Write a protein that binds this DNA or RNA. Sequence first.
RNA 1: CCGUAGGUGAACCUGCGGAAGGAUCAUUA
RNA 2: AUUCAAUUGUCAGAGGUGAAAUUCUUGGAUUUAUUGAAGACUAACUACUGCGAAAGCAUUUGCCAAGGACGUUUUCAUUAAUCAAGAACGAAAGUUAGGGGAUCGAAGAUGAUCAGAUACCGUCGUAGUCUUAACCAUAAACUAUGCCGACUAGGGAUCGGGUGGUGUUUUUUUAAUGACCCACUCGGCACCUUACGAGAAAUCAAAGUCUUUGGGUUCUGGGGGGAGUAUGGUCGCAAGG
Lengths: 127, 81, 148, 154, 150, 181
Amino acid sequence: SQVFGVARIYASFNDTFVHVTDLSGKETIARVTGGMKVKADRDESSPYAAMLAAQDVAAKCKEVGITAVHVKIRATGGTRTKTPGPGGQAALRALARSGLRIGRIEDVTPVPSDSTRKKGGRRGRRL
Amino acid sequence: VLVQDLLHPTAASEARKHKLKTLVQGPRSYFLDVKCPGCLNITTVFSHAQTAVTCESCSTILCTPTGGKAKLSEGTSFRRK
Amino acid sequence: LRVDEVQGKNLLTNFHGMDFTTDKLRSMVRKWQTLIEANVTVKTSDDYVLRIFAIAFTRKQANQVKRHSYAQSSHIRAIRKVISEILTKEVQGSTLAQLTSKLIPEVINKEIENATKDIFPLQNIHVRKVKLLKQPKFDVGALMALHG
Amino acid sequence: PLVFKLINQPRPPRVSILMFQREFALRLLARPGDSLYCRLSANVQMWANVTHIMKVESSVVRLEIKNPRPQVDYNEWDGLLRIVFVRKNRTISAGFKSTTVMDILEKNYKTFLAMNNEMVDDTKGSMHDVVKEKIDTVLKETDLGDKRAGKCDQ
Amino acid sequence: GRMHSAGKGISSSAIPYSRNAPAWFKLSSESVIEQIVKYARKGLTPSQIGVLLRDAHGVTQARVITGNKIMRILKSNGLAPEIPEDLYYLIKKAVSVRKHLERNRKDKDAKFRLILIESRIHRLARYYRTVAVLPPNWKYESATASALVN
Amino acid sequence: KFESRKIMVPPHRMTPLRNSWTKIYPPLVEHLKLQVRMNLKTKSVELRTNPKFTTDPGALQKGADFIKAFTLGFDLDDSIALLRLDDLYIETFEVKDVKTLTGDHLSRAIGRIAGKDGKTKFAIENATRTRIVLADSKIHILGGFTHIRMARESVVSLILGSPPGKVYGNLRTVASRLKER
RNA sequence: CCGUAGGUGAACCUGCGGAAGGAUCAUUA
RNA sequence: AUUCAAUUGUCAGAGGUGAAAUUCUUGGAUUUAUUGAAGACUAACUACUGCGAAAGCAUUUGCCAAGGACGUUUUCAUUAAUCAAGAACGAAAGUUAGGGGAUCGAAGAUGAUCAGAUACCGUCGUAGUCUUAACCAUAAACUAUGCCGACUAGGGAUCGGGUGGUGUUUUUUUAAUGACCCACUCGGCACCUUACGAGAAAUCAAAGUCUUUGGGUUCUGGGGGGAGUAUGGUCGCAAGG
Ligand SMILES: [Mg+2]
Ligand SMILES: [Mg+2]
Ligand SMILES: [Mg+2]
Ligand SMILES: [Mg+2]
Ligand SMILES: [Mg+2]
Ligand SMILES: [Mg+2]
Ligand SMILES: [Zn+2]
C-alpha cells in the first residue's frame, strides 16, 4: 500500500536529533539538529525547535513521498539515562501532528548488561 | 497461665513438642520389621536407617537413606517394633 | 533479516536473527519471582553456528498463600540442565527452515512446559534472542529453495 | 611560573624586591628532606640565590640571578624534575614506563640520538633494553632510582 | 556452644528411658559380640560397627544388651586402634585440606580453616595424652601426619 | 484510515484502573472523540481511531500520552491539565544516575525527596507548577520546560544529599523570580 | 564526617571506599 | 555497554553548560548501518532475603577441599567457657617489581566567565583503577551495643532441614515424586504490641532478672584541654602503625 520509513529520535539534555531513512539504514533521507532551527543557544533542545525540526523532516518525507514511518526513540544510554527527554515526546507529537502515517513506536535504547564508571566520580555530577 | 501441671501434661500436647524438650527425653523413632516377598524372612530395620541395608540373601535395597526417615521399598510390607 | 541477492529491482532476503522489543523485557521481569537464563553454544545440521537464549520462570500455583515464589539453586540448576538439553537436541534434529517453523507456533516452550512440569512450575517461556555467529561457504540454490 | 619570569630573562637586574604568597616563599626556601620541597626549590637553589626578609598572609622574598650561570640545560632538567616531582611519593624506575611518558621519553631519546645515529635494535625495551631496562641501568649508574625525590640533591 | 563457629544448634541422639533390653529383641549377647568381632575383622571404625549394628540388625545400643561399651569388647579382643577414631579423622581431614592448599596457594579461607582444624587436633591431642591412651611423647607434625595417613 | 496504538498496563495500577475507569473513559470519548478497547488478560489497551471520528491526528498521540501518564502513577486532574494544555510533558530519571547509592543510602535519598508527611514534595509541587510521583527508583515530574527545569535543579540538589532547608531557600528564590516574570 | 592519597591554603578543594551521628509522601498486595 | 579501528550514507553543526566559552568538523564531524579489537563489569531479576570469623560476597559450567542447620533406640566421656604472650585474615587509598591499561581519573596542561545566588563547569588527562609476587594493618571496620549459660511475652511471617495429612495440584490407569496448603518442630535474618522491669530520657525481649545490690570471664574510662603532642621503645623501603 504505502511506504514505511525508519525513524530515529535521539534525545539528549541539550539537543534533539530527528533522523530518518528507509529500511536497513541504507542512505539517510532527512537530517536535522536542534542548533539549525533556533539560533539561540539557550533553546537548542526546546520543544518549539523540536516541533519545527520534525515539521521540516515531515516536509522532507512528504516531498520524497514517504507516508508511513516506523520510529524508535532513545536517550544516550549506557552510563547516562535510559528513557528519552521531552524533546523526543514533542517530536512524537509533531510527527503525529504532521499528518504522516505512523507504523510502530518502540524504545531501542542501547541498554548495558553491566555498565562501566560514569563521568561524575563518587560525589555526583548534576549541580 | 499462672498455674498448670508441669508434672502431668496432656499427652496430646506432650508428644506434640520437640524430641529433647519433653519432661523425660524420649526418641521419636521406631523399628521396622520388613518382608520382601522374594525370600520371606524377618529383617528388623531402623526407621531412620542411614545406610543402604540390603537383604541377607537377595540383593534388594530394603531402604535408602533420605534425610530424616528411610524410605522403604515399593511393594514391600512392614510392621512396627 | 539480511539481504543477499538481486532479482531485477526485487531483493531476496535471508534469516539473520530474532529479538524482542525492550519494553517487553521491561514489563516482563517481575519483582517477586526467580528469573532463569539458559544459554547454549550451537552448531546446526546445516553448518550454521548459532546462540540461543531461553528464559524461564516460577509460577504461582492455584493454591498459593505465599507472596513470593522463589526457587532453590539446585532446582534452578536442574531446569537449566533441562533447557540446555531440550534446546540442544531440538536445534540438532532440525535445520533453519524447521527452526523458523517451530519458532512461530511456540512448540519449543511447550516442550519445556511439559518436560519441566516434573521439576518446577514454569511460566512465560520463550527463547528471547537469536544470533548467527558463523556463515558457511555461500550457496545459491539453497537460498532460492528457501525462496521457493 | 611566578619566579620563572625572573630566572631566565636577558640583562638580569641588580636586586629583586617583591611580595608573594608565603607558601611559595616556603617552596623557594625548602630543605630537600621536606614535604615542602619541590622542583622550584632546586630551580632557585642552583639558579637564583634567595633568602627571606620582611614577613608580612604574604611574604617578601629577595632574588638574585647568578651572573656566572652554570651550564645546565633548563629543558631536560626541568622535564626530569617534573616527571620525578609529580610522582613525588613514588620511586623512579617504574614511574617512567607509565603509559604516555613511555612514548614521549623515547621520542626525546630518538631526537637525542638523531645526531648520534645509534642503531635501535629489535630487542628494544620490553624484555631487556632501552625502552624498559636500560633506563633502569642508567638510573642504577647514578645517584637516583632507589633514593626518592625527597632525598636526592643537585 | 559449638566452638570454632557461631551456631547454636541442638541436634543429637536421644536415649530411651529403658536401661534393660527391649522386649521385641530376641538375639543373645554372645551372638552380637561375635557379630561385632566379624565386623571388626573388616577393619571398620567403631561408629560404623554401631551404625550397621543399629540398621541391619535392630540392636538398640551396644551398652544395654551387653554390659560393655564398644571398645571394651573391642580391646577385650585386642583389636583397638593405636590412635582414637576422631583424632585420626581430624588428621585425615587436615592432610586433605593440606593437599588442597598445596594445590592452591591463594585460598585464604582454606588457610584459616586449617588453623581451626589444627587447633582442634592440638586440643584433642592434649586430652588423649592426659588420659594416656596416647603415648606422652607424641607430638603433631604435619609431615608425620601425612606419614600416619599414608 | 484507522490507527491503533498498543500500550502496557502496570500491575501496580490496574486496581485503580478498574476503580476509576468509569471516570477515565467518557471525558476522552466525549470531548476528544476516540475509541478504547481493553485486553485485561494481556495488560494491553487498544486506542483506536476511525474516519467516522473527527480528523485530529495529534490527539491520538495525546491519548497515548494520557495512558502513558497513567502508566507512571499519575492522577486524573493532571490528565485534565494535559487535556487543556500542550506544553506539559512527562519525565523519568533514576536515583543511581546522579550518585551511586546502595540500600539504606537509597532509602534515605527516597526519604529526602519524600520528606516528613510529604512536605518537601508539597513544597516542590506548589512553588513550581509540577506534579510529583515517587517510584522505587524513579522520579516523575510533569510540566513545561521553565517549570520542570527548575524542578531538575531542585531534585538534583536534593538527591545529591543537600539539606532540605537549602532546597527551600533556593526553591523560593526560583519561585520568586518565576512569579515575578 | 571517617580512612587513605594529592594540589595546595589567608582559608580550602579534589580522587577512591565506607557511615547517617540526615526527613517515607502517595500507591498496592 | 563504553572507547578505538575498518567499511557505509548525508549535510552545518556536534560538544558542553545559571548561562556562555573553549574542543574538532569538506580529509564529511555528531549521528545511521556492517563488522573487529581491548580491558573492566556482572543491571533489571534484588527483598517481605542468603552465606562467611570479619573485611566481604550476585553470568553459566566443571574440578578442588571446606561449613552451618536438621535427622540419628550412632561414637568419645569432661575432652569445656573466656582470653595477656604469640599467630591467621583484614575494605578503600597507599609501596616495590611485572603484565595489561577500555572507562573513570587527585597532579599537571588548558580555557574560561560574571557577578557578589556563584564556582561547582569543560577537554586532554599521568599516577592509579585491573591482575600476578611481596608489603602495608588503618575506616563512621557501626548493631555507634564483648563472649559463653539459664530464665522472663506472644503472634504475622520468611530462609534451611525434619515429622504427619483417607490435604490439593501435576496423569498415564492408580501411584511415585516435584510444586502448593495445613498443624507443628528445631536453627538463622527481621517485624508489631506492650511493662512485669530498666533508663536521665530517647527508647530496650535486652539496654530486664542491680541498694531485695554476687552464673563465669576478657578489655577500656575517671572533668575539659595541653595531646595522640614531646620522648623512649617496637615493626615497616617509605608513607606510617
Ligand atoms: Mg572459643
Ligand atoms: Mg546450646
Ligand atoms: Mg558524639
Ligand atoms: Mg592481646
Ligand atoms: Mg582503630
Ligand atoms: Mg584529663
Ligand atoms: Zn529378601
